Design a protein around this ligand. Structure first.
Ligand SMILES: NC(=O)C1=CN([C@@H]2O[C@@H](COP(=O)(O)OP(=O)(O)OC[C@@H]3O[C@H](n4cnc5c(N)ncnc54)[C@H](OP(=O)(O)O)[C@@H]3O)[C@H](O)[C@@H]2O)C=CC1
Length: 247
């Protein structure tokens, strides 16, 4: 299991939690020094638990699928909540079995659904440590009306930080303040899948992608990424999704 406590948290301590979470994921091998996630794992090896405690000492435990870093559901006390999707239904057979009640959220875990339910897009939802404290609280005292946006903060502060070093560094830097993510963050989140496939193809094609990927950089310019020498491959992406785990 991996844990993170917000009381006394620093940039450094949030960096240690995201590297511990990366270390908990089994890998096929490495491509360009980047770990390639596994394509299938039995249910007894497939989920990892993260325990998160807020400034008031309130804790939630979150289940993640180690093949794709997707959050399946979470537990607050004796209640478990799972997303409304097939993979989360499979996860419930394996995790939080001793919870007294199980609640199926009315949405699946994807951003187009969550943005809909929150009535707010990702660029106007604050991120940073204090925003994670707040998401913890909201999901511990489950408020149907407030959960989708709390889940987006949760996902971007765990899975998305684990997938990319730039997301991890922007988030960990806000210890006592909050910020709105730029489109460079949103574009990396959007393109994990596509970038992971192209990296795998490039490994058999002298480092060149088969189809370019369009990202948004820090100046807000659209950039066309075509090979493994690009900064995003060399010094940002930290986890690759297996080609068989999209399909
Ligand atoms: N020609 C090419 O380069 C090709 C590329 N692929 C690509 O893959 C397709 C789709 O991939 P997609 O699934 O969009 O991938 P992403 O990289 O965006 O998905 C991976 C992770 O899903 C996010 N995410 C959303 N909800 C959760 C949750 N609950 N827990 C954890 N992570 C979450 C983010 O992006 P997001 O919300 O977007 O999922 C994120 O980086 C594209 O259409 C694209 O083309 C496939 C065929 C061809």
């Amino acid at each position: 299991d991996v844990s993170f406590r917000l009381s006394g948290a620093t940039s450094s301590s949030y960096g240690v939690f995201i590297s511990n979470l990366r270390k908990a994921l089994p890998n096929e091998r490495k491509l360009y020094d980047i770990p390639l996630l596994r394509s299938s794992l039995p249910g007894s090896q497939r989920y990892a638990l993260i325990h998160l405690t807020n400034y008031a000492d309130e804790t939630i435990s979150v289940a993640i699928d180690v093949t794709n870093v997707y959050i399946m559901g979470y537990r607050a006390g004796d209640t478990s909540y799972f997303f409304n999707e097939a993979s989360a239904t499979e996860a419930a057979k394996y995790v939080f079995k001793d919870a007294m009640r199980k609640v199926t959220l009315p949405y699946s875990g994807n951003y187009e659904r969550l943005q809909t339910a929150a009535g707010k897009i990702r660029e106007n939802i604050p991120l940073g440590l204090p925003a994670l404290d707040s998401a913890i609280t909201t999901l511990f005292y489950y408020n149907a009306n407030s959960a989708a946006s709390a889940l987006m903060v949760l996902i971007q502060s765990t899975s998305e930080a684990a997938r990319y070093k730039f997301i991890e560094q922007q988030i960990g830097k806000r210890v006592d303040k909050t910020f709105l993510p730029s489109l460079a963050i949103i574009s990396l989140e959007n393109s994990w899948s596509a970038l992971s496939k192209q990296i795998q193809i490039a490994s058999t094609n002298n480092g060149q992608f088969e189809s370019p990927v369009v990202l948004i950089n820090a100046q807000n310019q659209r950039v066309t990424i075509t090979n493994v020498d690009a900064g995003v491959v060399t010094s940002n992406i930290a986890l690759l999704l297996n080609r068989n785990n999209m399909a």
